[PDB]
Design a protein around this ligand. Structure first.
Ligand SMILES: [Mg+2]
Lengths: 232, 191, 9, 349, 164
RNA sequence: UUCAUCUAGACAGCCGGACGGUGGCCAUGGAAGUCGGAAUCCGCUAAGGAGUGUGUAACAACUCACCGGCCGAAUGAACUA
RNA sequence: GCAGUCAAGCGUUCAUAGCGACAUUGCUUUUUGAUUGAUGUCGGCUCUUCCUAUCAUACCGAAGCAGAAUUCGGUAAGCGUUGGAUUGUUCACCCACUAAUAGGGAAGCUGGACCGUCGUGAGACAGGUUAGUUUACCCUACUGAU
């Protein structure tokens, strides 16, 4: 009787349920049926623009993303039954977020492409920070004292409570501007990034960590074998 | 549902020792000793090793199982206070009248004395609870630090300091003067 | 117009 | 004049007002009546109920009607300001709705007491009492929209400043960002805010200063745009009606860097359009941001406009920089001295 | 202070340092406090609380249903009209007459009394009661002339009729 | 009691994603999902409302709708007494 | 209140056999803010006690609540809650005074009826019978004393 009252929100999108997983299963079955090479890739913290750029980097080829367990069942996890032989060997090696690339193109070409592709994204927690940052003592500016301060406008007054509470930074509002009483450095080179340190770097919006598409292995519809390629 | 048994775990790090007898709990770690009288609760304590202690309720109802997790969290807080302590940072702010905060000794006891709050001629005294030490932050404006083993004592001292400087018969939209808990953390902050 | 307005003042 | 209407009692919405009046009746009047009492006592009980509720409703309505300014018999400047801020016909009809509700409640109270005169049982007396209170509740609920509207009007008009038209006012106008905000905060301790975009402050601002033992006031406009002005939004109509109804030395500001984005040609055109608005007023034109360029060493193309506005009588020209306290005080002294000269002629009159 | 001075003050100086957490904890306690008021308010305040809570629940249910549907998409002491003394204040000259044809209610005056199920003496006296057939004036202006009054006027303080 | 979801992973939490025409169309000084009035569309999608709220002068930022990783196990809703 | 409008639900299960919570036309009614008191057998004073449905005093909550003043609300009965006029005693109301001059319960002097007559499109008779009983030196309460 003393129960938490669930939040009631009137929004359009509804959770799809079992039928969406069914359709994903069917689509991966079709792709494996009608393509030759299926690569397994890891895309953990990847933005939708990057996903769409990789999606448009081929039209004949197909990219499938979704539930790891559903994909591992579709590919085949046991020796009682599987779509093709020795597929459990590839399925076991998948680790995190799943990515399936279906193609008929050249293995060396796709390897070269995924090696060359690189993006500079937001930094992430528990990762090395490429460049250090230290808020100066002055009126706090939006970018963080990197771009011309005279050009940029200072941080909005609306973000001062967030910085003071979640970001653990002593901040005060003077005449409407955020300031600090002494320079405050957030991180050093190759230092484990906290959740809040990642948040503050993203809040200043200096996207600097180098993101890349990695592949764990692939499979073929002609030789039916697992080759371990470690491209990062 | 009137469960036969419910259990909660209490982990004990490698430096602290917990003594429990007739629901009196003594926790002795690197930083001192805390004692809690839990005889107002009806639970059973057991240990399988020096690293884990079970708290169990037999044939209890909803309120009994509600108290079980509370007992576990209180002992956890005692362990945390004896191993890492608690540090509450408060900041006092004003518009016109600078708040003057001092540590005074009146009748052989520690008091936080607050002077000139909104121009008041009244002296405010907040007795310092035993076990919590009061400091004033270096290279920081208007910050007072309360450090202690007992989170209950530290948090109640900070609450007393915050409530003693209430704004009366004014607009809290306009008058922002007061002492506020800026941050709550531990006495060790390695990372 | 404006002259009418100021006259009406 | 009254010059202020912060002393308007707070207006409650229909449901809150209904709760207030009915609960006050239920608390402040006796609530226990018995069927075994005398019929006369039962009638007295319920008549007192009806009368008390009617009194409460009409006294809340009387507070409402006495609080708000009569925009019709008020000073013309305040009248135009109130019209521009909140539509005058809408304001008048909301007040008239309040008045009609007051009259209807009073009439219903008298009528149902007249009917209760002949109460024949506790049941019938209770029925009549409920009927009277229900009719009053229906009236108040129909009065919903005027109550919310007049509450908003009450808050805003309480927050409006206190400008006396029959004072020595120095009116300040031009485009935004030109330096009106800086000029006001320099000559007076007024707390306006300056930002690099148009219509930064959407309301008139006031300040005060002294000059030769005389209390002058200074008004800063929101800003005006140069158009045919057949249709205009209220933000700049406030400034227009202030310039119209304020006997002041209009101190129009100008820029030569065009920082607001408008052309100096547009500024000259706007000044030429507003020139017929200026009746028995001495006008000055101060050029700001002049540490970069001045009319002395400006191009002749703009000097054509300068000689045209010099041809325009009887305005006078000056360039000033806000940092120079002596320069801003000389601008103030010129404006105050010409106001003094006008009033000295009036005293000769 | 003039214009939006408190909002300008919030922009220039912010709020109190604990404003956000204070509001958050207050509205988190709000549910416990609603339950406490429901179980601890007594008397008229409790009855009003329950009534307003029921109205809120009805409103939220209607709102959710509408959202989903759009998403899918001697003296005679009875009222009269003029030896038997009849008080004037009980005289009624007009009434509210509803027409079952178009379902409209119009304020229509009383002129005569035809049928009174209680007494023909009441019919003579002009006494208004329930189910009494009266004559109205349609001079104000398919439309009738007679109306059956539906409620006892001596309680409601007015006359409500249905045009036949 | 009846509906439901669930180890081809349930409830609760953390961390990610939350995209493109597009700052859709009209009046506004300005209004970019969030002062206003009308259908609310098309593509890529595991998934992403021409937007659930805070928030700016407008932005931005956060957020939830929805999907994923994390660990492991039943959980939720509406009624009846 | 009247007729409605659909229905949250209900009706021996039964959607327009039938009901029905909560929510939405018109009223004294015309708009721009014009002129448009009852109570006679009750009432005074004093004075005790009690209620709280609080007028003031105490402490809190909210509100464009800047300050000042106020509004609405919460706990709260500890403590108080005027002098006079008034075209019938009264209360409404006026003059002022005050922190305020809240509303109620319990609650000793005092400022008729019936019987009978000539008549009746129509007045009178003053004929006759009948009643109107609560205005201390004892017991006890209280206040003092042996
Ligand atoms: Mg500007």
């Amino acid at each position: 009787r003393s129960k938490r009252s669930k939040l009631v929100t009137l929004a359009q999108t509804d959770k799809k349920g079992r039928e969406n997983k069914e359709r994903i299963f069917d689509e991966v079955r079709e792709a494996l049926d009608t393509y030759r090479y299926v690569w397994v890739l890891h895309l953990d913290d990847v933005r939708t623009p990057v996903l769409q750029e990789i999606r448009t980097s081929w039209a004949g080829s197909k990219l499938i993303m979704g539930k790891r367990k559903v994909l591992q069942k579709a590919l085949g996890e046991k020796r009682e039954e599987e779509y093709k032989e020795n597929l459990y060997q590839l399925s076991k090696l998948c680790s995190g977020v799943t990515g399936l690339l279906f193609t008929d193109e050249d293995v060396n070409t796709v390897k070269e492409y995924f090696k060359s592709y690189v993006r500079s994204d937001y930094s992430r927690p528990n990762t090395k920070a490429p460049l250090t940052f230290t808020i100066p003592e002055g009126i706090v500016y939006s970018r963080g004292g990197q771009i011309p301060a005279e050009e940029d406008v200072p941080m909005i007054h609306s973000l001062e409570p967030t910085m003071r509470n979640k970001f653990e930074i002593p901040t005060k509002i003077k005449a409407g501007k955020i300031t600090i009483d002494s320079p405050y450095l957030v991180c050093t080179e190759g230092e484990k990034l906290d959740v809040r340190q990642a948040l503050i770097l993203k809040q200043f919006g200096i996207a600097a960590s180098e993101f890349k598409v990695k592949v764990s292995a692939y499979y073929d519809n002609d030789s039916s074998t697992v080759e371990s390629t470690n491209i990062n | 549902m009137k469960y036969i048994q419910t259990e909660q775990q209490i982990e004990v790090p490698e430096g602290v020792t917990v003594s429990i007898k007739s629901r009196i709990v003594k926790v002795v770690g690197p930083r001192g000793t805390l004692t809690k009288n839990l005889k107002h609760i009806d639970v059973t304590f057991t240990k399988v090793n020096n690293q884990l202690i079970k708290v169990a309720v037999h044939n209890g109802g909803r309120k009994h199982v509600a108290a079980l997790r509370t007992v576990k969290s209180l002992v956890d807080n005692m362990i945390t206070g004896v191993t890492k302590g608690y540090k509450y940072k408060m900041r006092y702010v004003y518009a016109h009248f600078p708040i003057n905060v001092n540590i005074v000794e009146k009748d052989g006891a520690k008091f936080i004395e607050v002077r000139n709050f909104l121009g008041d001629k009244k002296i405010r005294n907040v007795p310092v609870r035993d076990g919590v030490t009061i400091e004033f932050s270096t290279n920081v404006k208007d910050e007072i630090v309360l450090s202690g083993n007992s989170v209950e004592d530290v948090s109640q001292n900070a609450a007393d300091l915050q409530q003693i400087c209430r704004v009366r018969n004014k607009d809290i939209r306009k008058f922002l003067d007061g002492i506020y808990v800026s941050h709550k953390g531990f006495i060790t902050e390695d990372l | 117009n404006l002259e009418d307005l100021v006259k009406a003042t | 004049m009254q010059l202020s209407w912060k002393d308007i009692p707070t207006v409650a919405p229909a449901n809150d007002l209904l709760d207030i009046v009915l609960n006050r009746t239920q608390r402040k009047t006796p609530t226990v009546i018995r069927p075994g009492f005398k019929i006369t006592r039962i009638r007295a009980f319920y008549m007192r109920k009806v009368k008390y509720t009617g009194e409460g409703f009409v006294e809340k309505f009387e507070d409402i009607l006495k609080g708000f300014p009569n925009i019709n018999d008020v000073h013309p400047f305040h009248r135009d300001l109130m019209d521009t801020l909140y539509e005058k016909n809408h304001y008048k009809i909301s007040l008239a709705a309040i008045s009609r509700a007051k009259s209807l409640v009073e009439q219903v109270a008298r009528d149902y007491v007249r009917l209760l005169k002949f109460g024949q049982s506790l049941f019938q007396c209770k029925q009549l009492k409920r009927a009277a209170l229900g009719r009053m509740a229906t009236i108040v609920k129909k009065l919903r929209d005027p109550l919310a509207y007049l509450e908003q009007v009450r808050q805003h008009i309480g927050r409006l400043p206190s400008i006396d038209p029959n004072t020595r006012t120095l009116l300040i106008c031009g485009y935004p960002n030109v330096g009106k905000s800086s000029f006001l905060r320099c000559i007076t301790k007024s707390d306006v805010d300056v930002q690099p975009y148009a219509f930064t402050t959407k309301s008139l601002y006031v300040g005060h200063f002294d000059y030769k033992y005389l209390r002058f006031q200074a008004i800063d406009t929101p800003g005006i745009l140069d158009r045919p002005t057949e249709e205009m939004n209220n933000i700049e109509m406030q400034s227009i009606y202030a310039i119209a109804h304020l006997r002041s030395c209009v101190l129009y500001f100008m820029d030569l860097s065009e920082q607001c984005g408008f052309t100096i040609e547009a500024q000259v055109k706007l000044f030429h359009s507003i020139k017929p608005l200026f009746a028995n007023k001495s006008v000055m034109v101060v050029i700001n941001k002049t540490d970069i360029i001045r009319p002395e060493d400006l191009d002749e193309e703009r000097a054509q406009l300068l000689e045209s506005v010099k041809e325009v009588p009887g305005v006078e020209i000056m360039t000033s920089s806000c940092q120079l306290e002596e320069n801003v005080m000389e601008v103030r002294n010129k404006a105050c001295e010409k106001l003094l000269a006008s009033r000295i002629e009036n005293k000769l009159k | 202070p003039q214009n939006d001075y408190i909002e300008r003050h919030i922009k220039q100086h912010g709020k109190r340092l604990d404003h956000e957490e204070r509001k958050r904890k207050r509205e988190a306690r709000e549910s416990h406090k609603i339950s406490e008021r429901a179980q601890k308010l007594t008397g008229w305040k409790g009855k009003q609380f329950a009534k307003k809570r029921y109205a809120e629940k009805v409103s939220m249910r209607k709102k959710i249903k509408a959202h989903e549907q759009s998403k899918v998409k001697r003296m005679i002491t009875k009222h009269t009209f003029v030896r038997i003394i009849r008080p004037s204040a009980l005289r009624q000259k007009k009434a509210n007459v509803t027409h079952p044809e178009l379902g409209v209610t119009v304020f229509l005056p009383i002129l005569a009394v035809k049928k009174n199920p209680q007494s023909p003496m009441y019919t003579q006296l002009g006494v208004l009661t329930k189910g009494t057939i009266i004559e109205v004036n349609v001079s104000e202006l398919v439309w009738g002339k007679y109306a059956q009054v539906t409620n006892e006027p001596d309680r409601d303080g007015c006359v409500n009729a249905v045009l036949l």
